[PDB]
Amino acid sequence: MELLDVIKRPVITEKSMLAMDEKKYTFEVDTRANKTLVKQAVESAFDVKVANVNILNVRPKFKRMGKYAGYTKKRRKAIVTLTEDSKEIQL
């Protein structure tokens, strides 16, 4: 796929902010994606030199609204750890 549709959005949570304060940023990603593609995507989207990338894929979380029950969509969340001698992405 294309590098900007690879990434979808960031994950604003307490854990993610605590990681932002340690220079590694969370991002939701195309579920079909790849770690090297996340790396390429961020490197082309921010001119920042990436150091490491971790990935999780989150299960679909059960939910319901009245009679009707279902599943939250699957997600894939990458954690992009940057280098020193590098910028800090601004969100």
């Binding site: 294309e2 900007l4 549709d5 990434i7 979808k8 959005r9 960031p10 604003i12 989207a45 969100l91």
Partner: protein, 59 residues
């Protein structure tokens, strides 16, 4: 819109598509935050990407 898009040339169409794509990226970020109000700009950008790719394909 489709009029000026059909007036454009190929490399210009593709540059415009890439720029709309970057705008959509940034809008997804601003929507993940509470930093955006005009949400319909999202659908507008996606619509316009579709118009451009359709014009390329139909050329």
């Amino acid at each position: 819109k489709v009029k000026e898009i059909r007036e454009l040339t190929t490399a210009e169409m593709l540059d415009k598509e890439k720029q709309l794509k970057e705008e959509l990226f940034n809008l997804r970020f601003q929507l993940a935050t509470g930093q955006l109000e005009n949400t319909a700009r999202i659908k507008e950008v996606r619509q316009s990407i579709a118009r451009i790719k359709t014009v390329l394909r139909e050329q």
